[PDB]
């Protein structure tokens, strides 16, 4: 692990130190999310992607051990993406491969769209955020449901969420439960929830909708400027496969160098649920 | 190459001879098909899958350089599958990975269903045959049209068909053209087409419908007993991606260990159209 200052924000990141083309991992979730998500959430892939390249994972704005956004105006999708981009510029990353999950996928997409010179490959995993908004309800309804039904307890909450989305499940690693718990009791987490509740309607959600609209625009125009791989779990409970397929149709419309991989007996956490196939497929995509 | 006798049928096959897990390639087409399909149709894949295992390719019944079925009763999908099974048994293939394309895909399924002891992994590529029958028309309508509009000439026919199906391909290799021309003009081809016209309605087509109904039954029952990969080209013209997806949905119902890979800018011959991606993905899948 390491810590650095990115445009006035204290950012924690992970670096493989290998001398290969870099792979940047952008995790899911957003600031103030009822579940803490961090570098450790990548779990085994941090080691597993060692063969395919120099692995880097970064804590997003206002998540993990990274600082909250400097201003309320920065509670936007674009601020997050720009934070990751500035982080990459700071580390002199080139020939980059972006692997994003959930909300991170959205981040990754934007970067690919906004900075093709830096990015060579893009991987989107189970990202309802990058995809068009659901026809009814919100992308948060599943999560609101899971939060409201959660039993008291910090670890109990995390296990509750894992039970909510795991399909090919086993108990979470104890270390991760400990770290995620530590994140959960943290004052920054409280501040994150407060910031979300404060800035969701004014800043975050509009940036989300406008972001989806922009991504859809680019997909209908020239598509993504880099080779794209979409990974999804057939049994994903938060985000249905249908929107994953639809997102693939939108990408495939004008992005010739693109592919879709659907894994059965997997949920939102495909890399966790079906680790070996995920590594085999995504790894195959990265090493070509 | 080599020739061996499989239940009284002269059978041509290719074996790289490596001491690795076997990969059996079953090519497309059926006996009497207006285009000859053989081991050579696999082209680069024959060398390319050398990395992933011991490659074997076999000419199907009444196809390539193998003899026509001995009896009119043997013009069935099950007879073809039985020929391939018998062939694999004679050479002592175990831990087999079945990779079937188009009609071969159907064969690949049957064996997987019928001989789990022999088969360890399954790959289906662009198989309208394995998929359910079309809601309107037949799986041959596309081909009947391609046949009827073809200009005179053997090479002219083969390039006509290639133009009909190619998406990211360039003019065919001359090496393949000579072989395909010789196959087309050969007396055996004439005998195969005549035999097809003779046995299509009574034996072959009922065997096809019954095969589809049976496969669907097994898929809805216990599914396939081996890890399965379904590969498809998004721009497939003979067999639309929708029916491919439908087939994957049918498989995924009870086959936990299954995946679907959709490749953009590829058609029926995915392995030709997107060679590097295809080799990467399928090769990664075969090696786990
Ligand atoms: O985990 C996520 O990335 C996420 C959070 C909230 C809504 C949707 C999503 C998603 O993209 O799966
Ligand atoms: O690929 C084939 O061999 C084929 C030929 C004729 C109709 C359908 C198919 C198929 O399964 O795609």
Residue numbers in the entry:
A (entry chain D), B (entry chain A): 24 to 311
Task: Share the article's original sentences.
MehpH is a monoalkyl phthalate hydrolases discovered from Gordonia sp. Strain P8219, a Gram-positive bacteria, and able to dissimilate several different kinds of monoester, such as MBP, MEP and MEHP18. The structure of MehpH, determined at a resolution of 2.3 Å, exhibits the typical fold of the α/β hydrolase superfamily and is composed of an α/β hydrolase core (residues 24-152 and 225-311) and an α-helical lid domain (residues 153-224). The tunnel is narrow in the body of the structure, but significantly enlarged at the substrate entrance, due to the flexibility of the NC-loop. The catalytic triad, composed of Ser125, Asp259 and His291 with His291 bridging Asp259 and Ser125 through hydrogen bonds, is situated at the bottle-neck of the tunnel, suggesting this tunnel may be involved in the hydrolysis process of MehpH.
Structure superposition of the apo and ligand-bound MehpH revealed no significant conformational change on the whole structure of MehpH, except for the stabilization of the NC-loop in the lid domain and formation of a narrow hole extending from the protein surface to the catalytic Ser125. It appears that the butanol is highly dynamic in the structure, as only one butanol molecule with intact electron density in the four MehpH of a single asymmetric unit. PA is tightly embedded in a positively charged pocket that is made up of residues His53, Phe56, Ser125, Arg126, Thr152 and His291 from the α/β hydrolase core and Asp162, Met163 and Tyr166 from the lid domain. Of note, the location of the butanol is very close to His291 of the triad, leaving no space for a water molecule to attach the Ser125-PA intermediate.
